[PDB]
Curated annotation (Swiss-Prot), chain B:
The lineage of its organism: Eukaryota, Metazoa, Chordata, Craniata, Vertebrata. Transcriptional regulator that acts as a repressor or activator. Binds to Maf recognition elements (MARE). Plays an important role in coordinating transcription activation and repression by MAFK. Induces apoptosis in response to oxidative stress through repression of the antiapoptotic factor HMOX1. Positively regulates the nuclear import of actin. Is a key regulator of adaptive immunity, crucial for the maintenance of regulatory T-cell function and B-cell maturation. The chain holds residues 9 to 129 of 841 of the full protein. This is Transcription regulator protein BACH2. It comes from Homo sapiens. Signal peptide: none annotated. Residues 33-99 form the BTB domain. It is linked to Immunodeficiency 60 and autoimmunity: An autosomal dominant primary immunologic disorder characterized by intestinal inflammation, recurrent sino-pulmonary infections, impaired lymphocyte maturation, and variably decreased immunoglobulin production.
Length: 120, 125
């Protein structure tokens, strides 16, 4: 007979830990340059999220990997999307909602249109 | 200092699960992994960040490690029979055990100080 445990909190706790690492720049492995701003990340997390980042990061080897995103990607739209990849949460205002949606479109994140948003 | 009320919300209740599923897929394919674990002469590919996030032992072992190629030999306390199901728990949130391996696995979990097991019905003795 088998003993089974399925942790309901585990997946979310790991990502929380990954995000804490990102924020403190611990154990990251890529720097993304987006509109001249540097963003540290775990390539594996980004690739898990988007087929865009998979294609962009799978080949890579260079000791200190640095990847510049093209000009369609702005810092204002990207920051919240990087945060989302880790937290599963977006919380935007009128200043950035347009840019975030447009960025998500460029990065081919399928289900992030106007209609996915609710109000607090 | 945002402009406007940050009131437009989206929260995905599947996202995290989907990320760990992607990570586990990477592990099984050995694509986008970044560390080899040697446990009782057997190799396991993994992601150091993920290990450090699941385990206090791995956090302390790995936090300063910025090398690209990284191989980590675990001590004799860690056996393959004991570690197998824990690495699998780390990447799936699921732990399946039987009478045959429960002790060896629980003991290994204590050594590695694995997280997110306190809500399970396993005693740690």
């Amino acid at each position: 007979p088998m003993y089974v445990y399925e942790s309901t909190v585990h997946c979310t706790n790991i990502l929380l830990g990954l995000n804490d690492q990102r924020k403190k720049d611990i154990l990251c492995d890529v720097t993304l340059i987006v509109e001249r701003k540097e963003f540290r990340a775990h390539r594996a997390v980004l690739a898990a999220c988007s087929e865009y980042f998979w294609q962009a990061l799978v080949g890579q080897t260079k000791n200190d990997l640095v990847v510049s995103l093209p000009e369609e990607v702005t810092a204002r739209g990207f920051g919240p999307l990087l945060q989302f990849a880790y937290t599963a949460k977006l919380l935007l205002s009128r200043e950035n909602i347009r840019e975030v949606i447009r960025c998500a479109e460029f990065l081919r994140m399928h289900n992030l249109e106007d209609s996915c948003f609710s109000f607090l």
